[PDB]
Amino acid sequence: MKVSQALQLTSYTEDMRAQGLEPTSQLLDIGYITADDRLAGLLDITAGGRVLRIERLRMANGEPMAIETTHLSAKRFPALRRSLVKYTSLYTALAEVYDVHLAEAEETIETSLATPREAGLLGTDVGLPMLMLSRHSQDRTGQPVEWVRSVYRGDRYKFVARLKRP
Amino acid sequence: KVSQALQLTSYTEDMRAQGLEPTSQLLDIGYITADDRLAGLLDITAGGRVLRIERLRMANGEPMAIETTHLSAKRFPALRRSLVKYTSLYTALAEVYDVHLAEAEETIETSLATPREAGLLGTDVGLPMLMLSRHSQDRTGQPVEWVRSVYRGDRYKFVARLKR
Ligand SMILES: N[C@@H]1[C@@H](O)[C@H](O)[C@@H](COP(=O)(O)O)O[C@@H]1O
Ligand SMILES: N[C@@H]1[C@@H](O)[C@H](O)[C@@H](COP(=O)(O)O)O[C@H]1O
């Protein structure tokens, strides 16, 4: 009953199409925040710099799957907030509006528990182990584009990696 | 909180690459009979003999994970004393059997700590654990191991580099 998701630099939209599921989203919160030192470092901006934060509930065939909170430089992408009225895919929006294409990313996978609000939104018991992901992505020019923190349903996901030994 | 980068490396290698000292306790080792599932994973007959190895993994001194390894008993005579000799299963495989891992599929998912696991790992029953399952094949294309590891959710982080 779990989606088996390959670990690769792909969008949620791409990932769900690969599963033969229909991706939809509910915009939970969107707006600008000021970067602290941590976030400024992750986005290569000056501390105090403005960050577009996008929080979305991602669904598959209508069922909650994940809550994603992505962070981008507002200075680099000042029309991106409005462009998400037009695009359902952030990665598509980046490519079409700004000709930005992701090339490399570091992803982390951890497990812990949801907040009460997250559990409510995902329709899971608050004691259910969840998959807490982060993704730090850079584009073809080597600039960091996004820093994402996410909560994926522990009862709906496993991730799969291919390993190679030289 | 060990942030462990993912590639086909041994626990031993992973620990040394982080300055941490790799230490393990051998909990149990013995034969089991393969069901169809395990027989498929190890390319043996549905009633064949599997070596199951249970190990406690410690990062420095503190419990980190319980690792359950499955291999074909027929293919690896005297694996028990070989593991004792080399400590690293991957070192034993290479030095003793001339078996070298080439690729693996690793699954990452969540689970809850069982009473046995909570006891061994010094944690509480029913708290989140990261569960990794590794299916590895050697340079001849044969499966070598099927491994299931349960990590303390509060101490372990899986890291992957993604490329498009
Ligand atoms: N884990 C990634 C996120 O880091 C990324 O922000 C999202 C964009 O998805 P989309 O282009 O559908 O909006 O895709 C994946 O889910
Ligand atoms: N998850 C893997 C497992 O598949 C593998 O057998 C094990 C080998 O480690 P070692 O006994 O130190 O050679 O490394 C673990 O991290």
Author numbering:
A (entry chain A): 87 to 252
B (entry chain B): 88 to 251
Quote the study's own text.
DasR from the Gram-positive soil-dwelling bacterium Streptomyces coelicolor is one of the functionally best characterised members of the GntR/HutC family. The DNA-binding sites for DasR are cis-regulatory elements with a length of 16 base pairs and are termed DasR-responsive elements (dre-sites). Gene repression by DasR is abrogated by several effectors such as, for example, GlcN-6-P. In addition to the regulation of the N-acetylglucosamine-related catabolic genes, DasR also participates in global processes like cell development and secondary metabolite biosynthesis. Members of this family share a common N-terminal winged-helix-turn-helix (wHTH) DNA-binding domain (DBD), but display different C-terminal effector-binding and oligomerisation domains (EBD).
The structures of DasR-EBD in complex with GlcN-6-P and GlcNAc-6-P were solved by X-ray crystallography at 1.65 Å and 1.85 Å resolution, respectively, in order to characterise the effector binding of DasR. Both structures contain a homodimer in the asymmetric unit, and each effector-binding site is occupied by a phosphorylated sugar molecule. As previously observed for NagR, the phosphate moieties of GlcN-6-P and GlcNAc-6-P are ‘sandwiched’ between the N-termini of helices αE1 (Thr99) and αE5 (Ser175, Leu176, Tyr177) in the effector-bound DasR-EBD structures and are in addition coordinated by two arginines (Arg142 and Arg144) from β-strand βE2. The sugar ring in each effector is recognised via direct and water-mediated hydrogen bonds involving residues Tyr98, Glu154, Glu193 and Tyr238 as well as via interactions with hydrophobic segments of Ser97, Arg221, Glu232 and Val234. Furthermore, in the complexes of DasR-EBD with GlcN-6-P and GlcNAc-6-P, an additional β-strand termed β* is formed in the linker segment that connects the DBD to the EBD. Interestingly and different from NagR, one protein chain from each DasR-EBD dimer binds the phosphorylated ligand in an α-anomeric configuration, whereas the second chain preferentially binds the corresponding β-anomer. Although differences in the hydrogen-bonding network surrounding carbon C1 exist between the two anomers, these do not lead to differences in the overall conformation of the EBDs since the average pairwise r.m.s. deviation of the Cα-atoms of all four monomers in the two effector-bound complexes is as low as 0.61 Å. Effector binding to DasR reduces the spacing between both helices by 4–5 Å in total. Binding of the small molecule effectors and the concomitant rapprochement of helices αE1 and αE5 considerably reduces the volume that is available for GlcN-6-P- and GlcNAc-6-P-binding to a mere 90 Å3 per pocket. Whereas in the ligand-free structures two surface-located openings provide access to the binding pocket in each monomer, the binding pockets are completely shielded from the outside in the effector-bound structures.
